[PDB]
Amino acid sequence: DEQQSQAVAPVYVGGFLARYDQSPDEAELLLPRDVVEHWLHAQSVALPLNINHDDTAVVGHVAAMQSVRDGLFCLGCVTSPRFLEIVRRASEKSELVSRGPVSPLQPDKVVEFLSGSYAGLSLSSRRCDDVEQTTPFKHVALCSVGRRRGTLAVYGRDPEWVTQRFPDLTAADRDGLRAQWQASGDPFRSDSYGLLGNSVDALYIRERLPKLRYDKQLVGVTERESYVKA
């Protein structure tokens, strides 16, 4: 009963929403540093964090967005108790979760589950297309894999520890983030049936795993140890 309270405690997520050094496979995915930094400075209210862009599946909020040297990095927090309770339960029934985490990390079913199902981040921003460079950043979505390479999502119970998984990040970067991450109920208006529904869609994404490994390698989270399952 206490173990179940530790499992449903807030969980943090971090990762790049876009890698400046990565030319997208599609023109509409182009999101350059000049634009990002402008948009950041442009738009207060936190961007909501949801599951695969579903407005009824908001599970938390983005706590910090920072533009670093290699891209736009963000740090958010899964806070919805309904989503976490669901995850808590689904995790108990995952052969993958049961096999546990790597080398010296302690098992963490909830975190491990999110680490497996939503290994990527996917931004929701206004169409760039190079014109009239309002709130451009709509929200951030946890997903099976992102359209932009390098968007691998890293989950952990501590924000510092999450940011620490990324070698590219400097102290000044981890500092700009720490400054930021330091509503009115449960934002989650969905359920297990929905997540399950969304799971089959994930099964049909092309080259899902290969992309994730690529993302894992590009962001250097391969080196450090974490709950990533890709």
Added chain:
Amino acid sequence: DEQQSQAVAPVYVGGFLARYDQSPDEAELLLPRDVVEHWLHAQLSVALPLNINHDDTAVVGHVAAMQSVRDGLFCLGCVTSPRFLEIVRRASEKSELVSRGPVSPLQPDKVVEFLSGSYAGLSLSSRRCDDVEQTTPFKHVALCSVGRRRGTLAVYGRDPEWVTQRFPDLTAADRDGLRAQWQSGDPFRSDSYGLLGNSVDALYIRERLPKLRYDKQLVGVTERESYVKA
């Protein structure tokens, strides 16, 4: 609420549990025709149960017929659990893949389409062969994201004949031997959280999609039209 009764009606599943013309990647998967036909004749008294990814608490129906044809062992089963179907009914409403609907002239069928996407394969549960003292060798059949034996693609439909009709290899004499065979409570002791749990595991099977397409091509279901999503 009549549409919801048509959606939760029994669903049939068919496909090969093993292709004799396919040498397994692992020795323990070897299941030759001589053995099969012997085992068949050996045991079909009590029906083999049909479950999700080999989970004893996830029995969703039973196998109605097992026949050894020229290219392999083919089976036809029926998903009958109302609990499993109600779960599927609901999850289907939340699948972008299901919403896109079926091919060319097939009518949309959320439940069938959902099962078609999540459990595209069949996986037998039999006694270790290993070539020795070759009683009930056939334990059960499991619906899964993809099978270990190639050609084990699963085809779902509301009509048994129509299901068997999806396989070109099958002859009339074959469809006849099957039709002869497929003529107290809800065996499902699991839930959405469990299926959801099992979904993350699926996400990490290697070459899942490529295998399915292979299976789809090997069994010639590529030619005919069906609810297959692979």
